[PDB]
Structure formats: structure tokens, C-alpha cells
Amino acid sequence: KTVVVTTILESPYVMMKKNHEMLEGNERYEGYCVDLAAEIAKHCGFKYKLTIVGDGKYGARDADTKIWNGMVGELVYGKADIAIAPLTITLVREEVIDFSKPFMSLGISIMIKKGTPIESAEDLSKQTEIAYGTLDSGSTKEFFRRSKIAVFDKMWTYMRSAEPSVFVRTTAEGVARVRKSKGKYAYLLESTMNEYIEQRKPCDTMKVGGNLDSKGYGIATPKGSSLGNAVNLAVLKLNEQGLLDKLKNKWWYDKGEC
């Protein structure tokens, strides 16, 4: 049967082609994950259908109702057979779904509007003129919520109680907030996304400091899935052949605008 792939509209991973209205099925999309999905499918030997997650979220469990949302939820409840997106491998998720070895290594980072007098997470924590937040319903927000590290705990204490909210629904919203903040808002997002945006016009943002942590993205399948083993081996084969590095160069720098 055709494999249902859940993914998310997050540039440069998955995007609508300029003339998608003229196209059909998988041909409507382009991007790093679109390219990766085609390769994984070929090496594993399956036909697939790309679908954008309904609620546009990555995946988090709701305490009380205990219902998983986002791409994780589509896998948990059987709405999708595999997730190919910039989905962070975390303990809570690994407890309900399977992840292949990582296809991309990254870490949480700081995005500022050029000129902002901030160079580290410690800098953000010791001041208050500049506000900062993260994406909502994701691994980045969870990192700070659960952190027992002094600096990060101090950062979370502030963010969770900040008003108006410093959190955003999508990466694009966070980037826009930084650009129009006149330097009064710094955004906390994963390094890969930070690096991508720094190469996009109007070239007014920049990544500062070292990553706050280290983790990776993995292809996810429902627990006990028949595709798990093959997909994992495919990811390892493709990394060792250099495809993964080739794809990042293609979507990040080959198309750099700065």
C-alpha cells in the first residue's frame, strides 16, 4: 500500500512550489525533506504520499487529556505511516514512536537582529530590555521548561511569565518578530533554521554564541512499524554516501541570498 508521509510546511524542508496549483500530488512540494523522502522511498522500495500535518505542529502531549498532537500524534493514532521532517529526537517522543538514527545534527541557538548587544544565553538572562522566546509546542520550549541549569532555568522563569507572550506558533512568526523588533526581541531556535535564515534577504539577522545543546532530527515511524528497520539503514547508507551533506548544501548555501 502507498505509505502516508506526514510532514510540515517549514522552509527549507518542505515548501509549496511557486506553481503548485498547476501540479498534483507529491510534485506540489519541494525542499530538503521532499528530496530526502524520495530517496528513502527508493531505497526502501515503497510508494508514498506526502501530506502536511493538519494542526501544523511538531508534536507534544497535553497533560490531562493525554492526547498527542502534531506529526507525533498522526503516527501515534495511525493517521500517517512515517514522518519525514525536522523532528527532534527526544526521550518523551521516543517513548511513543520510533526514530531512525539522526539525519541531521543541531542544537538550540540564538537569533538576533544585527546590532543587538547580545552574544550568549547568559547575556539574555542577565538583562531585561531585550525580550526573547521560542516556538510553541516543540522540543525547544520543553528544553527550557525542564532545564535544571542555572542560566536556562532563569531564562524559562522569565519566558513562561512574560506578557504579552514571547512564544510563537511558527518559525516564520518568530523571525518576523525579530526583524520588526528594532533589536528588542531575540529568538531561540534550532541552529539549522538559524543558519538558513541568516542567508535569506534582507540579511538582517544573525546567529550568535555557541549552541545551547546537542541533538538531532530523525525519521519517525509508529512503534512496531514494518518500515522502521529499513528506514534506519537507509538513513545510515545515505549519510555515508554524502547525500545528506549534499542536500544541506543545496537548500542552505547553494541558494544563499546574502
The residues of the shown chain that bind Zn ion, judged by CB under 5 A, are 39, 62, 64
Residue 128 marked ligand-binding: no
Q: How far is the CB of 102 from a second copy (least distance, A)?
A: 7
Give residues in contact with a second copy (CB under 8 A): 89-91, 94-95, 99, 101-102, 105, 143, 146-149, 213-216, 218, 232-233, 236-237, 239-242, 244-245
| Residue 64 binding target from a second copy, Zn ion, none, CB below 5 to 8 Å by type | Zn ion
- Spell out a b/e string for 68-97, using b for 16 or more CB atoms within 10 Å of the CB, else e: bbbbbbbbbeeebbbbbbbbbbbeebeebb
Residues near 249 by Cβ (< 8 Å), separated by ≥ 6? none
Q: How far apart are CA 39 and CA 26, in angstroms?
A: 13
Q: How far apart are CA 197 and CA 175, in angstroms?
A: 8
Residue 190 marked ligand-binding: yes
Q: How far is the CB of 254 from Zn ion (least distance, A)?
A: 19
Residue 177 marked ligand-binding: no
Q: Are 114 and 205 in contact (CB under 8 A)?
A: yes
Nearer to a second copy, 17 or 101 (CB): 101
Residue 139 marked ligand-binding: yes
Nearer to a second copy, 4 or 230 (CB): 230
Instruction: Please list the residues that pair with 132 across neighbouring strands.
Output: 186
Please name the amino acid found at residue 158: Y
Q: How far is the CB of 194 from Zn ion (least distance, A)?
A: 29
C-alpha dihedral over 84, 63, 156, 220, to 10 degrees?
-10
Q: How far is the CB of 149 from a second copy (least distance, A)?
A: 6
Annotated binding residues: 86, 88, 93, 139-140, 190
Annotated binding residues for L-glutamate: 86, 88, 93, 139-140, 190
